[PDB]
Amino acid sequence: PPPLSHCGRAAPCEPLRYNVCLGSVLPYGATSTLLAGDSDSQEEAHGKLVLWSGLRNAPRCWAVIQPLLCAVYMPKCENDRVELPSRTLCQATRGPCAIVERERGWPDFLRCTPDRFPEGCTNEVQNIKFNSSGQCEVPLVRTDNPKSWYEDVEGCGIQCQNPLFTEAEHQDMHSYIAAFGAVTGLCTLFTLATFVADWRNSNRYPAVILFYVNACFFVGSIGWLAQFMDGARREIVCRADGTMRLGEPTSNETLSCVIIFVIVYYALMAGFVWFVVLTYAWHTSFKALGTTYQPLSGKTSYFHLLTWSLPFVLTVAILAVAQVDGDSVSGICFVGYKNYRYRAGFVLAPIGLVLIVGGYFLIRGVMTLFSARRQLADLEDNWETLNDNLKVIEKADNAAQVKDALTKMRAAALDAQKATPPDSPEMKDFRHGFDILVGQIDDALKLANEGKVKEAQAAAEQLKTTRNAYIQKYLERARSTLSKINETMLRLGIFGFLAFGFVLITFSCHFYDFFNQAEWERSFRDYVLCQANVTIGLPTKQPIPDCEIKNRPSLLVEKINLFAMFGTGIAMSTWVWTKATLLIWRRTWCRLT
Ligand SMILES: CN[C@H]1CC[C@H](N(Cc2cccc(-c3ccncc3)c2)C(=O)c2sc3ccccc3c2Cl)CC1
Ligand SMILES: CC(C)CCC[C@@H](C)[C@H]1CC[C@H]2[C@@H]3CC=C4C[C@@H](O)CC[C@]4(C)[C@H]3CC[C@]12C
Numbered sequence: 001p002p003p004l005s006h007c008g009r010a011a012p013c014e015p016l017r018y019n020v021c022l023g024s025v026l027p028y029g030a031t032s033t034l035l036a037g038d039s040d041s042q043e044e045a046h047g048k049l050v051l052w053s054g055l056r057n058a059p060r061c062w063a064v065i066q067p068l069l070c071a072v073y074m075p076k077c078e079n080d081r082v083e084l085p086s087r088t089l090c091q092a093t094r095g096p097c098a099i100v101e102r103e104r105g106w107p108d109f110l111r112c113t114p115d116r117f118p119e120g121c122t123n124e125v126q127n128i129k130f131n132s133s134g135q136c137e138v139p140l141v142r143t144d145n146p147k148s149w150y151e152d153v154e155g156c157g158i159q160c161q162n163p164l165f166t167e168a169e170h171q172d173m174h175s176y177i178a179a180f181g182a183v184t185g186l187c188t189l190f191t192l193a194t195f196v197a198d199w200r201n202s203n204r205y206p207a208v209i210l211f212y213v214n215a216c217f218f219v220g221s222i223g224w225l226a227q228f229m230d231g232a233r234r235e236i237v238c239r240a241d242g243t244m245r246l247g248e249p250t251s252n253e254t255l256s257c258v259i260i261f262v263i264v265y266y267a268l269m270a271g272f273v274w275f276v277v278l279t280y281a282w283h284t285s286f287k288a289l290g291t292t293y294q295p296l297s298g299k300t301s302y303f304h305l306l307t308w309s310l311p312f313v314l315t316v317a318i319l320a321v322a323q324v325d326g327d328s329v330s331g332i333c334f335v336g337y338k339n340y341r342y343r344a345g346f347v348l349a350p351i352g353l354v355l356i357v358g359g360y361f362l363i364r365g366v367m368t369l370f371s372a373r374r375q376l377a378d379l380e381d382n383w384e385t386l387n388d389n390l391k392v393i394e395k396a397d398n399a400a401q402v403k404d405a406l407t408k409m410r411a412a413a414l415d416a417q418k419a420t421p422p423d424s425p426e427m428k429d430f431r432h433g434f435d436i437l438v439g440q441i442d443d444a445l446k447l448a449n450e451g452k453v454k455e456a457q458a459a460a461e462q463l464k465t466t467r468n469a470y471i472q473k474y475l476e477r478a479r480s481t482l483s484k485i486n487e488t489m490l491r492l493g494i495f496g497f498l499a500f501g502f503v504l505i506t507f508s509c510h511f512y513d514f515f516n517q518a519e520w521e522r523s524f525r526d527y528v529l530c531q532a533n534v535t536i537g538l539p540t541k542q543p544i545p546d547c548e549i550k551n552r553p554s555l556l557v558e559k560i561n562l563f564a565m566f567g568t569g570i571a572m573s574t575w576v577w578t579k580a581t582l583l584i585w586r587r588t589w590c591r592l593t
């Protein structure tokens with residue numbers, strides 16, 4: 001109807017000093033600085049407008065704030081009545097201009113109070129066209145897809161090429177990834193090729209574990225080398241709009257990111273559980289030294305179950321929560337790149353676990369080796385003490401010599417009685433055999449104490465038979481069980497520890513990244529906000545000053561993690577660097593020629 005009394009306020013009009021409000025020419029000629037609390041002059045108002053216009057970055061917000069700001073700072077005043085802006089004009093900004101309520105809060109007069117912004121006002125800014133759609137400041141890029149938007153800023157996503165690192169740093173990390181990826185690709189393939197060439201003999205535990213291990217590092221390397229194909233890095237890492245890929249799998253985008261993610265992460269996680277299977281193979285290889293062999297072939301089902309099933313669960317679980325993200329420096333897609341907390345439970349947890357489990361089996365194995373190796377050495381020493389003191393008693397002129405050699409024999413026999421090979425019926429006869437001998441040394445000692453040297457020496461000759469009838473039989477068994485330890489057994493443990501070291505390095509890199517990522521994100525937001533904040537409230541004078549990023553991820557750490565990941569692949573590929581396999585390839589060349 002004709003203008004509602006509540007949709008306007010009694011204020012003295014002054015003619016306009018600017019024909020234009022934020023780019024757009026105005027349909028009236030008089031204004032009032034009543035509606036703007038912060039402004040008392042028109043010139044002051046205009047300067048405030050120049051501060052608001054730092055929201056040009058944030059288009060989604062800019063597009064609704066422009067009309068609201070005119071309606072407040074440059075409102076129409078006609079015949080001592082100023083036109084108030086409608087509620088629906090003010091509320092429309094609350095959503096997309098949420099960065100305002102975060103960074104400084106909305107001023108009193110821009111909060112959608114019913115008194116200040118009445119209901120159903122014909123605003124008059126609706127007749128003004130605000131042509132400015134708005135742009136995104138570096139490192140954001142303009143996009144209308146809401147899945148690409150960076151937090152409170154809407155309309156802007158992070159550029160595909162990692163803003164935290166220069167182009168120089170990218171090609172350098174890519175050179176590094178190329179070197180390690182390719183070499184590991186060649187090493188693992190060569191090593192896989194030798195297994196399939198001699199498949200009949202190769203596919204047998206524990207040597208076959210290293211085949212599956214090398215398979216994982218081979219499949220993983222493909223995923224890592226993908227990016228170096230012409231235009232692939234951009235297809236895997238960048239979105240259609242030109243922002244980074246984040247939160248995959250997302251609906252309209254291609255599968256190239258999730259493909260590369262599955263290739264790398266599944267292969268990585270399977271390789272870690274195959275490593276634990278290697279450390280278990282090594283721990284149980286010593287328990288075979290017992291009467292029951294306990295075959296690895298029987299446990300093959302349990303291995304193939306865990307090694308393929310567990311990565312599948314983790315991969316599926318990741319795909320379900322949709323945490324696949326791309327990175328231009330690494331050139332692959334992975335879990336938890338953006339959301340670092342998911343990287344904890346899907347990368348740091350499993351590696352933490354394979355460290356504890358694999359490490360347990362590695363420690364528990366060397367404990368078995370060193371314990372076995374010392375128990376024989378100790379028995380050997382006691383047995384050698386017995387034989388040396390028997391010679392002394394044989395040669396003895398007198399009782400003092402005999403008593404001395406016998407007390408030493410006694411001590412060695414009691415000590416040897418304590419030893420165990422690595423209430424048992426075998427142990428009963430072992431401990432009893434020494435009980436007999438100690439009791440015979442006992443008898444011989446009495447003769448020696450009484451002075452009967454020839455009697456004592458005669459008694460000592462019976463210890464020789466007692467020794468041969470029991471203790472000899474068992475000492476030979478102890479020697480044979482430690483001889484059973486082949487070089488392929490120990491070589492497996494050497495590889496286990498060599499792999500464990502790399503795992504421990506990888507873990508520490510991820511741990512380091514996890515610990516410092518939160519600051520790296522904070523440092524980015526502060527840099528983003530700085531770019532908009534520094535363009536306003538600054539004199540025109542010299543060029544606007546560039547901002548900085550406090551902190552970022554360490555490329556040395558990334559290069560260390562890469563050396564550890566690919567280094568394991570290379571080290572594990574040296575399992576076939578033997579005489580035997582040089583024969584298998586030379587067998588083939590003659591065949592062909
Ligand atoms: C295992 N080694 C990791 C270390 C961390 C590396 N890393 C994490 C990452 C990657 C990609 C995207 C995001 C991300 C996107 C949106 N909001 C917050 C973060 C984070 C980054 O290099 C970047 S890029 C970026 C952009 C903005 C804010 C911080 C930020 C960071 Cl830190 C990857 C390799
Ligand atoms: C990612 C980027 C675009 C977000 C940053 C937008 C910046 C420029 C925004 C956020 C909060 C805004 C401020 C909100 C309130 C006021 C008080 C007013 O009396 C003068 C302008 C001033 C001081 C604004 C200037 C512009 C401002 C600082």
Ligand SMILES: *[C@@H]1O[C@H](CO)[C@@H](O)[C@H](O)[C@H]1NC(C)=O
Pocket residue numbers: 131132133
């Ligand atoms: C701005 O408006 C003019 C007409 O006044 C038009 O030619 C132009 O395309 C508009 N600009 C944008 C970015 O839409």
Ligand code: NA
Pocket residue numbers: 033034035036037038039040
């Ligand atoms: Na005022």
Ligand code: NA
Pocket residue numbers: 248249250251253254255258
């Ligand atoms: Na997808």
